[PDB]
Nucleic acid binder design. Sequence first.
RNA 1: GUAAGAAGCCCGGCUCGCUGGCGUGGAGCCGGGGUGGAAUGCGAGUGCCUAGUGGGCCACUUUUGGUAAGCAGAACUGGCGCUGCGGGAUGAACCGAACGCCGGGUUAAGGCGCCCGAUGCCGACGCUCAUCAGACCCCAGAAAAGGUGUUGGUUGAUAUAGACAGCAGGACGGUGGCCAUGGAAGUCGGAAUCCGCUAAGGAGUGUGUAACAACUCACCUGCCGAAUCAACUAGCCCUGAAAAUGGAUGGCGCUGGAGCGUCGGGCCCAUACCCGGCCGUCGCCGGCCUACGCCGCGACGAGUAGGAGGGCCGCUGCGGU
RNA 2: CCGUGGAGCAGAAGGGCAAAAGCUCGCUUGAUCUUGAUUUUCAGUACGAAUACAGACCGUGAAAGCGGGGCCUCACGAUC
RNA 3: GUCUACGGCCAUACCACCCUGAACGCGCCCGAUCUCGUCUGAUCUCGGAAGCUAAGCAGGGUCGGGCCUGGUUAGUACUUGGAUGGGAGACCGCCUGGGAAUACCGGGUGCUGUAGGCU
Lengths: 68, 175, 157, 185, 175
Amino acid sequence: AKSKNHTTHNQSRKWHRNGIKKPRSQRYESLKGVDPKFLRNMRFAKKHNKKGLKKMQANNAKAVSARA
Amino acid sequence: MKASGTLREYKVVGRCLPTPKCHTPPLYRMRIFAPNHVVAKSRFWYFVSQLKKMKKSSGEIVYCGQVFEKSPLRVKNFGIWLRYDSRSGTHNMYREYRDLTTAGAVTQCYRDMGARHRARAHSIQIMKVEEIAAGKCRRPAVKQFHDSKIKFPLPHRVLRRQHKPRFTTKRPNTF
Amino acid sequence: TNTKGKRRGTRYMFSRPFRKHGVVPLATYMRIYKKGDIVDIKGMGTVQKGMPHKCYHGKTGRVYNVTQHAVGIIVNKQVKGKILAKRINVRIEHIKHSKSRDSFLKRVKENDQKKKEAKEKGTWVQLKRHAAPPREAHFVRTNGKEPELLEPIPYEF
Amino acid sequence: DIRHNKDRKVRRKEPKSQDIYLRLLVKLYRFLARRTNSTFNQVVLKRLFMSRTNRPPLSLSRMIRKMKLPGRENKTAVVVGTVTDDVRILEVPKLKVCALRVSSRARSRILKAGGKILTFDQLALESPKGRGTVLLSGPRKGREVYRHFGKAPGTPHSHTKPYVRSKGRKFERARGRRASRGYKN
Amino acid sequence: MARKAGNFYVPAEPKLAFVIRIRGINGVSPKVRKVLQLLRLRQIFNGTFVKLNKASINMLRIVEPYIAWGYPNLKSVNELIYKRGYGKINKKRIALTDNSLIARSLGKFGIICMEDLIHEIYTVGKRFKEANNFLWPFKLSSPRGGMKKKTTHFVEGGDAGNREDQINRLIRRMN
RNA sequence: GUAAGAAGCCCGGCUCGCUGGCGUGGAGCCGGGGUGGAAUGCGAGUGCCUAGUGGGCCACUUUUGGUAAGCAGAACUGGCGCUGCGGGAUGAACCGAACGCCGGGUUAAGGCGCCCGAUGCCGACGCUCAUCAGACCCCAGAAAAGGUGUUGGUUGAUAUAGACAGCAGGACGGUGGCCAUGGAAGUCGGAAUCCGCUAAGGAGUGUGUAACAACUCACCUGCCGAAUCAACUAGCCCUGAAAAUGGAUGGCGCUGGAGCGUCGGGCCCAUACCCGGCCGUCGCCGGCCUACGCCGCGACGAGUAGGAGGGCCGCUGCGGU
RNA sequence: CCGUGGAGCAGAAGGGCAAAAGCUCGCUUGAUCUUGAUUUUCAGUACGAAUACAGACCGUGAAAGCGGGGCCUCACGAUC
RNA sequence: GUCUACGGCCAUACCACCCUGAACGCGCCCGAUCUCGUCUGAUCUCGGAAGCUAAGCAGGGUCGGGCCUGGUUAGUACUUGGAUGGGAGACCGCCUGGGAAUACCGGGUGCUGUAGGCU
Ligand SMILES: [Mg+2]
Ligand SMILES: [Mg+2]
Ligand SMILES: [Mg+2]
Ligand SMILES: [Mg+2]
Ligand SMILES: [Mg+2]
Ligand SMILES: [Mg+2]
Ligand SMILES: [Mg+2]
Ligand SMILES: [Mg+2]
Ligand SMILES: [Mg+2]
Ligand SMILES: [Mg+2]
Ligand SMILES: [Mg+2]
Ligand SMILES: [Mg+2]
Ligand SMILES: [Mg+2]
Ligand SMILES: [Mg+2]
Ligand SMILES: [Mg+2]
Ligand SMILES: [Mg+2]
Ligand SMILES: [Mg+2]
Ligand SMILES: [Mg+2]
Ligand SMILES: [Mg+2]
Ligand SMILES: [Mg+2]
Ligand SMILES: [Mg+2]
Ligand SMILES: [Mg+2]
Ligand SMILES: [Mg+2]
Ligand SMILES: [Mg+2]
Ligand SMILES: [Mg+2]
Ligand SMILES: [Mg+2]
Ligand SMILES: [Mg+2]
Ligand SMILES: [Mg+2]
Ligand SMILES: [Mg+2]
Ligand SMILES: [Mg+2]
Ligand SMILES: [Mg+2]
Ligand SMILES: [Mg+2]
Ligand SMILES: [Mg+2]
């Protein structure tokens, strides 16, 4: 009882009925697969930022506000 | 090409677009027989593409004008040059016709070709049309009319009104 | 039944071009690749260490990861049903920059310069692109030379 | 021409519930959202058609935190649905709030602080266009049903809590959850 | 003024083209069905105005076997805006009877009156896209003289093709 | 395949345990200033549950095995199945065209001698005669080859220094020449192949003799008197062409066409198009009149398997009325 | 002396390779440990194979560097 | 106008032959005691500076061979889409668009990034 083996007929119609839209592009996609050393350095820079940010950046903001 | 109804003569001039390598193209002209200016321009583009490296995108048509016959009241003889294509192979041909207008002679040529050789208008290239004198007429069917004091009756004329008096007691005399 | 494989049917795709065999040119190594730049993928046969799959050949994607001898690229691979954003780690031997992004950057620089320069003059410059408009009415010239008559050549075998 | 598979808007325009008070609230807020041209009236009319799932019960501490934000001093908190008492907090502010079917345990906890509550008809009588209001809603995805959803519990990044009869040992643990037996996800 | 010096003058290419759908619905490839949907030509025997550009020319060439396009005349545009004029102030097709209907939806650009609309259509400029999209696709009736060889191109002798100056003679019978 | 912006660019300052000549490079964060960035069209995003299906077939084109198949197996697209309607007489896939109930007009494909609506046009040009004519993609029949049957074309060669056909005359000498032999004396053979008077006769185009004789031809000339000869080429027709119940351009029939080729002006009708009425769905809604009711506008209505909503459709019994 | 691969690279072929991936020489087991992500048939499930990293210990050269098996495409196996 | 050291493009810059090279530099070249290695101080390594442009090398030339580019081939072979186009078929023509290569001919044959010495 030989039958049909494999065809791709009437497949593009099934695909285009729902759509072949591109994947959802969003900001801050992901951080997976990134170098572990680079990720560790980024975490350290993010967690040590508020130590010196809230003072020197505030002083510079006051200075630029006095400038303009 | 359809060649529907009567044909028309069009003088069509055209040149390629001015390119930085060379400007002022030679502005080639052609004399096309077509029913209207659209198919006239199309046939001109086809011929100039077959002749030289010119296309509709890289070129342009400057002027396309209807050409009237210089003597529509005179009976003239025209020699037509054909480059037609048969079922087996394409062949050249020289025909002669007798008509008042050049477009009329070209129509007669198209009809006679389609009738005698079953050649459609797709594969008929009109090469040259020129008015010839009665001395250079090689065709006997045309040469038999170059005789003054020509006299011949019209024998066995058809009725042509078979259905207007469809029922009658008459039998047409036909004389 | 078609013998699916990792390098099936790349006999002419992964081969080196004619008269270009030998060691790799050193200019392709000194190129800089940062995160976020749009690059292209072209499989090279000189090296076989980090070459991509045959389905990503000629594909353009952005870089999301950088390492010592390779880069991570996010490629939009169209599977039978939809498109998947796949992360691929390929060496720098098979990657080159995409000039489309460079042309776009040059165009945006020209635009933000032209507008900044014309703001003072008050001239509303048309910096937005457009399609090729139909050419306007022009005057040809024949300089007395009659247009040459064209006639179809008779058929000759 | 054009296919007719998406021409009918699947959204509902009439509450499936047969509650008479809810029907009267809909009849009132429909007239308001139709006349006053208020987007707040429009959204509070749309939120009345929603079902029991789409109207999650907002807790008390969440509303406390939402009202503690700057700019919510005298604004009236409006919750389309039930607001429930929270036993994790001990002290509550004035909390002038308008909600639907306030729980009895939260009734006393709000009335002892000094703040007065009112219903939807009283809210419409007070501020028709909805001025000086803050529309709050509970966690819609906080329901447990949304924790069993995802792509599949078999992909190596599922975290989808597959359906299991009884939780514990030797229940969907061996083959597909550890590298010792078969594979790891 | 050009013909006096024995020099030909070519006009500018028309920047506006009227397109009518010719073929049916079923039995069309997706590559051309998408272009037919983008040209707002869904049902048979309807026509719209298109601003001719390098992209629009190729878009029309892609779906050439299913459309008949030409360069409309002033009177043809006048007839298509007056008789078959329908604008959409909302997702509904409201008939154009009062100038207030145009001034309310399109008056923010200066097209308050129907004469302004006709002018913006026939003299395509900076505000042509909005004026063209405001107009519903012109539902045209069947022609009177009868379409000859609907499946064949206009150059070969049919109707589906480029009818630059001959499309007005067909608009007169379709409207 | 990618890009054609505000998820972008310019500026300043902080963090790094990453790298490191260097305050170097690279990432992260903060702060103020500047959206008009190819055309066309469109409202988008997303979650859950889920029936049926899991034997297909056909067509333009590209292709694998096979001689080939209405055979088997592939790629894109379309169609049938899931589909009615107008033409192909007939019909699964062809050509148009998609489907609520109606009135008017028009049309696609096709057709206008009668079946059967419309050429009953004072239709045009030309081809064709069959004792087997021909008459419209799929589609239902045919080849190589041939025709002094006609109709066109090409390359050529002859002819008033009188051709081509017809009638009539000549058609000789060296030489029954050289190789052969039972006979070859132009005529079964191999190689050759000239010469002289002529107006022309060819070591001879064929018939015939065992050979010689005889007829005849190339060639020249006499009469007539102006066009003619030969080879290819392609349109119709013809031969090639034989199967079994009587019979299939659909039939009758048609030949100054009711056939073939090129066309013109009209006309015929589909559930297609345009206008208008009515019914239903959807969208936008309108009103403080069963609000679960009452209106207004616009666009759309086919459908097996299957999925939903309405029923003031229907049967039985129970609680109220 | 000519010799651009016409030889060889374990084995069927394709790709690739010249102070080389070919032959010879000297030390060596990185053919060893560990957690992830990714590629390939893909339902984007698993096995097999493969890629780039990261964290310790070593080989090698002076060094930059290379190496966590065979120059690449196959050479292999769930529950109990 | 040139070279050396390090390099990008990797024959417009490779191959065979023939001419020129002043001042630096490259090299040829002279010698094995120390560093080093082979049968051989030929090759790799520490000592040079008696001669040379003989060679490499750098320029120029060949109606040179190759390489690049441009005409011709040619709107030709092919090809997207269409037809109730032709033909019995094989195949072909037409409309709308894109458009190849070998023969044959003509022109060129290194340009530059950093440090340095000369006329
Ligand atoms: Mg099957
Ligand atoms: Mg439907
Ligand atoms: Mg749905
Ligand atoms: Mg009529
Ligand atoms: Mg079968
Ligand atoms: Mg089959
Ligand atoms: Mg079935
Ligand atoms: Mg269907
Ligand atoms: Mg159908
Ligand atoms: Mg039928
Ligand atoms: Mg078709
Ligand atoms: Mg069809
Ligand atoms: Mg009707
Ligand atoms: Mg018709
Ligand atoms: Mg009748
Ligand atoms: Mg016959
Ligand atoms: Mg039939
Ligand atoms: Mg049959
Ligand atoms: Mg014949
Ligand atoms: Mg009969
Ligand atoms: Mg309809
Ligand atoms: Mg239906
Ligand atoms: Mg009852
Ligand atoms: Mg091998
Ligand atoms: Mg090889
Ligand atoms: Mg390591
Ligand atoms: Mg030693
Ligand atoms: Mg020694
Ligand atoms: Mg020595
Ligand atoms: Mg030298
Ligand atoms: Mg020398
Ligand atoms: Mg040379
Ligand atoms: Mg084709």
